[PDB]
Amino acid sequence: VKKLINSQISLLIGKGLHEFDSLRDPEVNDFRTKMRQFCEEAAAHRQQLGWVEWLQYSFPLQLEPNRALLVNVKFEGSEESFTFQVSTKDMPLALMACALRKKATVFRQPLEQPEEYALQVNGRHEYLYGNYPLCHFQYICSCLHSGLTPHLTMVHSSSILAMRDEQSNLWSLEQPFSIELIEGRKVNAMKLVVQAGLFHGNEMLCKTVSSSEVNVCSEPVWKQRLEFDISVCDLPRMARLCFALYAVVDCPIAWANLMLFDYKDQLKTGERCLYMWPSVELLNPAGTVRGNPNTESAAALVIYLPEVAPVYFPALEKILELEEELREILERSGELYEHEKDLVWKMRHEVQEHFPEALARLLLVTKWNKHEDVAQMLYLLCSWPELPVLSALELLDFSFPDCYVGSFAIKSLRKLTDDELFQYLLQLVQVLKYESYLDCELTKFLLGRALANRKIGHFLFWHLRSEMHVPSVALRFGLIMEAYCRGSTHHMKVLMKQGEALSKLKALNDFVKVSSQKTTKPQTKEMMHMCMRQETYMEALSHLQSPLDPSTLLEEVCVEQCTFMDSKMKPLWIMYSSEEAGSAGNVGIIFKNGDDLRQDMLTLQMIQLMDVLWKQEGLDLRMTPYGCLPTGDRTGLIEVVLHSDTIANIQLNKSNMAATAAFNKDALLNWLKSKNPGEALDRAIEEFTLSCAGYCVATYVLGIGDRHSDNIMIRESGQLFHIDFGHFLGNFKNRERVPFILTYDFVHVIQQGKTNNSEKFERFRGYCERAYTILRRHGLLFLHLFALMRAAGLPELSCSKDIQYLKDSLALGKTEEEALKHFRVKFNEALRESW
Numbered sequence: 161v162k163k164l165i166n167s168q169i170s171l172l173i174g175k176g177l178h179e180f181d182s183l184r185d186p187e188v189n190d191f192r193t194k195m196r197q198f199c200e201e202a203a204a205h206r207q208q209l210g211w212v213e214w215l216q217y218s219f220p221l222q223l224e225p226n227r228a229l230l231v232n233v234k235f236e237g238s239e240e241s242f243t244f245q246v247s248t249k250d251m252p253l254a255l256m257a258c259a260l261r262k263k264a265t266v267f268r269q270p271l272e273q274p275e276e277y278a279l280q281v282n283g284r285h286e287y288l289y290g291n292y293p294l295c296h297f298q299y300i301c302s303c304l305h306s307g308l309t310p311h312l313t314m315v316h317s318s319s320i321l322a323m324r325d326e327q328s329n330l331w332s333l334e335q336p337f338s339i340e341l342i343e344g345r346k347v348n349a350m351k352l353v354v355q356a357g358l359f360h361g362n363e364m365l366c367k368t369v370s371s372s373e374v375n376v377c378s379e380p381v382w383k384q385r386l387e388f389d390i391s392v393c394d395l396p397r398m399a400r401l402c403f404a405l406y407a408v409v410d411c412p413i414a415w416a417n418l419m420l421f422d423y424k425d426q427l428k429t430g431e432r433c434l435y436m437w438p439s440v441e442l443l444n445p446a447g448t449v450r451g452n453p454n455t456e457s458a459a460a461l462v463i464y465l466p467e468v469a470p471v472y473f474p475a476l477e478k479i480l481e482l483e484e485e486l487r488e489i490l491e492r493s494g495e496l497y498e499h500e501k502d503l504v505w506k507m508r509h510e511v512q513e514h515f516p517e518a519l520a521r522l523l524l525v526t527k528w529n530k531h532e533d534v535a536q537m538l539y540l541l542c543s544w545p546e547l548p549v550l551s552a553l554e555l556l557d558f559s560f561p562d563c564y565v566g567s568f569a570i571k572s573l574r575k576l577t578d579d580e581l582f583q584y585l586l587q588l589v590q591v592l593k594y595e596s597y598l599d600c601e602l603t604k605f606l607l608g609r610a611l612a613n614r615k616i617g618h619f620l621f622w623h624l625r626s627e628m629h630v631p632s633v634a635l636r637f638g639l640i641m642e643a644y645c646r647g648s649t650h651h652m653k654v655l656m657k658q659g660e661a662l663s664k665l666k667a668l669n670d671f672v673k674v675s676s677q678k679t680t681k682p683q684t685k686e687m688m689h690m691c692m693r694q695e696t697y698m699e700a701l702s703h704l705q706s707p708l709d710p711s712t713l714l715e716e717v718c719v720e721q722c723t724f725m726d727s728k729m730k731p732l733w734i735m736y737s738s739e740e741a742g743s744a745g746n747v748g749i750i751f752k753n754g755d756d757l758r759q760d761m762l763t764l765q766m767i768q769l770m771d772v773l774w775k776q777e778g779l780d781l782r783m784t785p786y787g788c789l790p791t792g793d794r795t796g797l798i799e800v801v802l803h804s805d806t807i808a809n810i811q812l813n814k815s816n817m818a819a820t821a822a823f824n825k826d827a828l829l830n831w832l833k834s835k836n837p838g839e840a841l842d843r844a845i846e847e848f849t850l851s852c853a854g855y856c857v858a859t860y861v862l863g864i865g866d867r868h869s870d871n872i873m874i875r876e877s878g879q880l881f882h883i884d885f886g887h888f889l890g891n892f893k894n895r896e897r898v899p900f901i902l903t904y905d906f907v908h909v910i911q912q913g914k915t916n917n918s919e920k921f922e923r924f925r926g927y928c929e930r931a932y933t934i935l936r937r938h939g940l941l942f943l944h945l946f947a948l949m950r951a952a953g954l955p956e957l958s959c960s961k962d963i964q965y966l967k968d969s970l971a972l973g974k975t976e977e978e979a980l981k982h983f984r985v986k987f988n989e990a991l992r993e994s995w
C-alpha cells in the first residue's frame with residue numbers, strides 16, 4: 161500500500177522516486193525526510209478542523225474584489241426544489257433559513273438551524289457561507305449581470321464531515337581565497353580560457369580572475385592556482401563562485417556556478433568536478449548552482465577547494481556579538497553616487513528608526529565582502545520592524561541573496577491573505593529558481609500554504625509540474641511536489657485524474673496532427689470523434705476538476721461538440737456538459753500543444769490584477785481575464801469563452817447573416833444589434849465601451865503588439881477582449897515603442913454609429929484616463945512583479961531594457977499631473993490615427 165502510493169506519485173510528478181535515491185545525496189535525502197515530516201503534520205491538522213474551517217480549506221469562497229433576486233434552492237437527497245425571491249443584500253444564512261422554513265412546511269414540520277448548513281453551487285466545487293451579502297459572491301454576481309437564476313443545494317454539516325473523512329491520508333582565516341583549476345572535457349574550433357569570479361547576488365565580491373591561454377583540445381589541463389582579492393574569513397554565508405569557459409582568437413562555450421559553503425554551512429573543500437551548462441557578460445551568477453545532470457555530455461571542469469585547517473559559518477549568536485541632515489532628499493531611481501551610500505551607511509540606525517521602509521536601499525549600500533559590515537547590518541535586521549507586503553516583494557529579488565534577509569521577507573510575507581498570495585504565486589514560484597539550497601524558508605512557506613488551501617495547492621502543483629521537462633529545476637520541483645503529496649493523498653488522486661485527461665489529450669492531438677496532413681478537416685473531425693468514443697478515452701477525459709480552475713467540474717465530454725482548428729499546432733476544442741450544473745456546466749477547454757503559453761499566462765495575470773485594482777476603486781471595466789495554464793512541455797490549456805467571436809470573423813461580413821452590412825464599418829455594430837435587440841443594445845454598447853477602455857490601457861502599458869482583428873474578440877454581451885498574447889513590452893515580432901492604439905471600427909460603436917458623439921466619446925476618454933491613473937498609483941507593484949519574473953527566462957523579459965518599458969509606459973518618473981498630459985499626447989495621436 162505504501163508501494164502503490166509511491167508509484168502513483170512517480171506517475172504524477174513525472175519522475176521516478178528511485179531517481180531521487182540513486183543520487184546518494186545528503187542534501188536531497190535530508191530535504192525529503194524533513195519535508196515529509198512537515199507536510200504530514202499539516203495533513204494531521206487538516207483532518208481535525210471544524211466543518212466550516214474544512215470548507216475554507218477545501219472550497220475557498222470566491223468573492224467580489226439593493227435589488228430583488230430569484231433563487232432556486234434544493235436539498236441534498238431530493239430533486240424537489242423551491243424558488244425564492246431574495247435580496248442581494250441578504251446573508252447566506254437568511255436564505256438557508258427560508259429554505260428550511262419551506263422544507264418544514266411541504267414536508268410537514270418537525271423541524272434544525274440554518275447554522276448547520278452551507279450552500280453549494282449546483283454542479284461546481286463552490287460553496288457560499290460566511291457573513292456576506294449575497295452579491296459579494298462571485299457566482300451570485302455572474303447570474304445577476306447575465307440574467308440567470310442561482311441554483312444552490314443545502315448541504316448539511318454532517319455531509320461535509322463525511323467529505324473530510326474520506327480524504328484522510330571563522331574570522332581567524334585571513335589569507336586570500338584560492339582554488340585550483342585542474343582540467344576539463346568538451347568541444348570547440350584557437351585557445352581556451354576560463355574566467356572565475358565571486359558573486360553575492362548580482363554583486364561581485366572582488367575582481368574576477370582569469371585562466372592562462374591553453375590550446376583548443378577536448379581534454380584541457382591547466383592545474384592553475386587562482387587567488388582572489390578577498391580574505392577567506394570575509395566570505396558571506398551566501399558566497400557564490402562562478403565560471404565561464406570560452407574560446408579565443410570570442411566564443412562562449414559553457415558556464416558553471418557553486419555555493420562555497422555547503423548546505424550545513426561548511427566551507428567546502430577540496431575536489432569538485434563541475435558538469436557545465438551550454439552557452440546561450442560571459443559570467444552568469446544568477447544561473448543554477450547545481451550542475452548539469454547530462455553527465456555523459458556536459459563539459460566537465462574539475463576544480464580544487466583548498467583546505468585551511470573543519471570550519472562552519474558562525475551562528476547568529478556570534479554574528480550578533482559582532483548631524484542635522486538631507487539624507488531624506490536623497491531617499492526617493494535609487495541608483496546613487498559613492499558619498500551618498502556612505503551617508504546611508506553612517507545613518508543606518510536612523511533608517512531603522514525613522515525610515516524602516518528603506519531597508520532595501522540600505523541592504524544595497526552595505527558591504528557584503530566585509531564580514532564586520534555584514535554583522536551590524538544583520539544586527540540591525542534582527543530588530544527591524546516588519547514591512548508592508550509591497551516592500552517584502554521587493555526583497556525577494558535576486559539582489560538580496562542573503563538568507564537572513566530572505567527569511568525576514570517571508571517573515572513579512574506571512575500576513576499575505578490567501579487571495580493576495582494567489583495573485584502572486586506565479587512570481588513566488590519562479591523565485592524558487594534563485595534559491596541556493598533545497599531546504600529553504602520559501603519552499604516551506606509555499607508548502608505550508610498549499611497544504612492549508614486546496615486551490616493554492618492545486619496551482620502550486622501545476623506551476624511546478626509544468627517545468628519538469630526543464631533539467632535545471634526538475635530535481636527541486638519534483639522534490640517539492642513529492643512533499644506535497646505526502647501531505648495530501650486524496651489531492652494526489654484528484655490531480656492524477658487530471659494528468660490522465662492531459663495525457664489522452666496529447667495522444668488525441670498527435671493523431672489529429674497526423675490525420676490532417678492526409679485528409680480534409682471533415683474527415684479528420686469524424687476520426688477524432690471516433691477515437692474519443694473509445695472507452696479508454698471517454699473515461700479518461702470525463703469527470704475531472706478543470707486544471708484551469710478546480711471549482712469548475714468537467715463532467716461528461718460532448719464529443720459532438722469537439723473539434724480542432726485546422727492550422728498550425730492543431731489545437732483541440734473540447735466541450736463538457738453536466739446535468740447537475742445546468743447551464744453553468746456547459747464549459748469548454750482548448751488544448752494547445754506546440755506553443756509556449758507561459759507569456760500569455762503572465763499577461764493575462766497582469767490583466768487580472770489591473771481589473772482587481774480598478775475594481776477595488778469602484779471601476780468595473782468589464783474585463784475577460786480567461787484561464788490559461790501551461791501544464792507541460794509547450795503544453796497547456798486555455799479556457800473557452802462561450803458566445804464570443806473574433807472581430808475579423810464578424811468582419812467577413814458574410815451574406816445571409818443578421819450582420820449583413822452595406823458598409824464594412826457597420827458590421828461590428830450590426831452584430832451587436834443582432835445579439836442585443838431593442839432595449840438591450842444600449843447595455844451592450846456600454847459594456848463594449850468599458851471593456852474597450854480597459855484593453856486600450858492594459859495593452860498600451862504592457863506594450864502588447866501584433867494586434868489584428870483575429871486576436872481581438874467580442875462577447876454577445878458586448879464585452880471586447882484580447883487574446884493570444886505572444887509579444888509584449890513593445891517587443892513586437894526588434895523592440896519598438898507601440899503607440900496607444902484606437903481602431904476606428906470601435907470608435908464607431910462607442911459613438912452609437914454616429915460621426916460625432918463628443919458626449920459619448922469624451923466619457924470614453926475619461927474611462928481611459930481613470931484606468932490609467934489608478935494603475936500608476938500601483939506602479940511599483942507591477943515593477944516588483946515583473947522584476948521577480950526575470951527569473952522565468954522568458955525571452956521577451958530578459959533584462960533591464962525590458963522592464964524599462966513599464967517605467968515609461970507608466971511614466972512613474974513624472975507626477976500625477978505631467979503623466980496625464982503626456983498620456984493625452986499619445987491618446988490624440990492614436991485618435992487622429994483612426995484613419
Ligand SMILES: CN1CCN(c2nc3ccccc3cc2Cn2nc(-c3ccc4nc(N)sc4c3)c3c(N)ncnc32)CC1
Pocket residue numbers: 723724725731732733750760786798799800801802804805806809883884885
Ligand atoms: C467558430 N467561432 C467559435 C469557435 N472558434 C474557435 N474555434 C476553435 C477550435 C479549435 C481550436 C481553437 C479555436 C478557437 C476559436 C476562436 N477562439 N480562439 C480562442 C483563443 C483564446 C485565447 C488564446 N490564446 C492563445 N495563445 S490561442 C487562443 C485562442 C478562444 C477562446 N479562448 N474562447 C473561445 N473561442 C476562442 C472561432 C469562432
